RNA sequence: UUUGGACAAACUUGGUCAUUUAGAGGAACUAAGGUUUCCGUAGGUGAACCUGCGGAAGGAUCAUUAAAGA
């Protein structure tokens, strides 16, 4: 008769949400027939289901996942894929899980992922059909299950220290195998 | 010819160090693939190529974050 999920927005994401608020609720209320409100008392959004006009149990999860992706920092038009498609997932980890490194070693490592003008990150998102965000030490990868793994195993080798040139060559191999 | 004294060349027998030369006898002895890059320390492999602990860059930063009239 009633079920709901409450989810919280961290402060640096708060302003982007306000600026986009009029864009995100029409897709939820129309296409999913959920009901929603922004509860500024506790810097959270709440999604609520009415049993009288809703289609199937999957609606409520899709809505939460869509909002959840936004607070991680994905673009709005990247998050919206979670309403449309059905098999997308998010993976996340932090560089201290791979290798313990601390000072300027830490800063250089994430610089090595982005590359100059972001061109190295952009490359990885093309050879594997996925989206990537770097939020200081934490990495989040959004995509299909097998594509995620292909992305992970190459971002890992950068933080282990391999030169960028060697990694571009590997991306060429993976891309041709997808063609087969 | 001879007593004692100071000066004092030099001789003999051992020890030790250095050198010349004959000269064995021997060892001789020589000739005719990696792929982040490094430092100190300890261990491993016929062999660069390996492994443990601590350190350096002399190595390529995309995106996002606060806004004011009782």
Helices A119-127 & A104-114, crossing angle to 10 degrees? 50
**How far is C-alpha A132 from the chain's CA centre?**
7
| Stretch (H or E) spanning A158 | helix A145-159
3-state secondary structure of A39: strand
Distance A95 CA to B1 C1' (A): 122
Return the axis-axis angle of helices A145-159 and A104-114, rounded to nearest 10°: 130
Q: Where are the alpha helices (DSSP H) in A89-144?
A: 104-114, 119-127
Taking residue A131's Cβ as centre, other Cβ atoms within 10 Å add up to: 18
From the alpha carbon of A114, which nucleotide's C1' atom is closest? B62
In terms of residues, how long is chain A?
180
Q: Which residue has the tokens 């998102």?
A: A125
Q: How far is the CA of A91 from the C1' of B26 (A)?
A: 78
C-alpha span between A132 and A60 (Å, rounded) = 25
Q: CA–C1' distance A86–B67 (Å)?
A: 40
């Amino acid at each position: 008769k009633f079920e709901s999920r409450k989810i919280m927005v961290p402060p640096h994401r708060m302003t982007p949400l306000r600026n986009s608020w009029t864009k995100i609720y029409p897709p939820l209320v129309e296409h999913l027939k959920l009901q929603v409100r922004m509860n500024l008392k506790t810097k959270s959004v709440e999604l609520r289901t009415n049993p009288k006009f809703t289609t199937d149990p999957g609606a409520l999860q899709k809505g939460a996942d869509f909002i959840k992706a936004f607070t991680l920092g994905f673009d709005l038009d990247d998050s919206i894929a979670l309403l449309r498609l059905d098999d997308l997932y998010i993976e996340t980890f932090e560089v201290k899980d791979v290798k313990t490194l601390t000072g300027d070693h830490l800063s250089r490592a994430i610089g090595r992922i982005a590359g100059k003008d972001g061109k190295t990150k952009f490359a990885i998102e093309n050879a594997t059909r996925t989206r990537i965000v770097l939020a200081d030490s934490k990495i989040h990868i959004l995509g299909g299950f097998t594509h995620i793994r292909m992305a992970r195993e190459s971002v890992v080798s950068l933080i282990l220290g391999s030169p960028p040139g060697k990694v571009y060559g590997n991306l060429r191999t993976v891309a041709s195998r997808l063609k087969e």
